[model samples]
Target: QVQLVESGGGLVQAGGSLRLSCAASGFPVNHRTMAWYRQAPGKEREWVAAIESHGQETWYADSVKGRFTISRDNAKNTVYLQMNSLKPEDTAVYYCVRVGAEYVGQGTQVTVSA
Candidate 1:
């Protein structure tokens, strides 16, 4: 069995940044591609970003505009999300997930306030 335990998401002032961590277990973080998702309050789930299994490629939604960074530490079996230039529109419950499998991390609620 595998697990994607996510943490670090809470209230933060707009214009600030947050680093969310996903500690993976029972599988290598780089064993498969992973994607970051966000579901805003009363909104549909949106794709934020994704990374290649080999860490050789990455893609992001147009809304990201270079503010979302997805990286992994193979040695530590962990994945990371560094969301910068936060804004109210960025408020959501974020998650780390495997691209094509059922392994999805726990949601971390992030709220941005002024």
Candidate 2:
């Protein structure tokens, strides 16, 4: 069994952006790319994108734009996700996941304020 734990405050201002990191402690370094997701409160979680460590390839969702960015450090085995121009509608739980057929991370909630 593997676990991906994230550490950060789950809050962002209505007009402010937030950056968070996901660190997997028990996975091998050569597993794969990191996955980012957005889960609206009480709704299904949506895939934000995935970033590859070797080539820095970013695959984003259709709705995503310049406001969202995903990155990772292969040497440190950490994944980072950043979201900007926060809005009330943007309030949700952002998750850092591993590249698997169906497995996912628990996700960290980010509360947005005015």
Candidate 3:
């Protein structure tokens, strides 16, 4: 019954890094996978990557390569998505999702700026 809660500044300068977090609750922390995603200012959602609660790696799409990663803290049952070398085009709400492609967090809003 774990859940995801994210919080971060919605704005970032070019070439900056973005860190969005997902706080999981209500379930065993190690039995799930956490995923990150991006939705262009006005486009469909793009899969970033998926990382198991143990920090095992898995990329959802070819485009997710480079500058993207997932990390987890089993003690706190929290997951995080880190991205760098960002641009204005990278601005959007990022969501942390559970495994099975069935559940997604409320989403964290991110806006890349100068």
Candidate 4:
């Protein structure tokens, strides 16, 4: 079974940017699409971005398309999420997920504050 671990979380000031990382084990991260999801306090999961299995094509939700970037480093079997111009509303627990079985990480919590 594949496993994923989300790392890198901290407080970021408003308008600042931060990058969250996810490392994969037991599977070839480069062989499958990778996704990032965020859950704010009391809110449903939000689709942030995804990196395609091949060629690493990245896509994001229309709301965050311009402010978010998704990329992967096949050598490290990891994917990254860069969030720019963060706001308090952006504070959430982020999870890394794959397309099928053995997907989803424990989640990394990030906070945006003054």
Among all windows of 10 consecutive residues in model 3, the one with the lowest summed lDDT is 53-62
RMSD of each candidate relative to the true structure: 1.2, 2.1, 2.2, 1.4
**Runs with alpha carbons beyond 4 Å of true place in candidate 1:** none
By lDDT, the better pick of 3 and 4 is 4
Candidate 2, residues 1-114, lDDT tens digits: the string is 766766564777787878878877777433677778878868997887788746777898866677778877777877777778877776677777777646666778888787
- Count clashes in each candidate, considering only residues at least 3 apart in sequence or on different chains: 0, 2, 2, 0
| Cα shift from native, residue 22, model 3 (Å) | 0.5
Q: List model 3 lDDT by residue over 59-88, tens digit each.
A: 655665687777777888777778788777
Clashing pairs in 2: 10-110, 10-111
Choose 2 or 4, whichever is better by TM-score.
4
Task: Report the alpha-carbon TM-score of model 3 versus the true structure.
Answer: 0.83
Whole-model lDDT values for every prediction: 0.87, 0.74, 0.75, 0.87
Clashing pairs in 4: none
- In candidate 2, which residue ranges exceed 4 Å CA deviation? 28-30
TM-score of each: 0.93, 0.82, 0.83, 0.92
Global lDDT of model 3: 0.75
Which residue runs does candidate 3 get wrong by more than 4 Å?
53-55
Clashing pairs in 1: none
Superposition error at 82 for model 4 (Å): 1.2
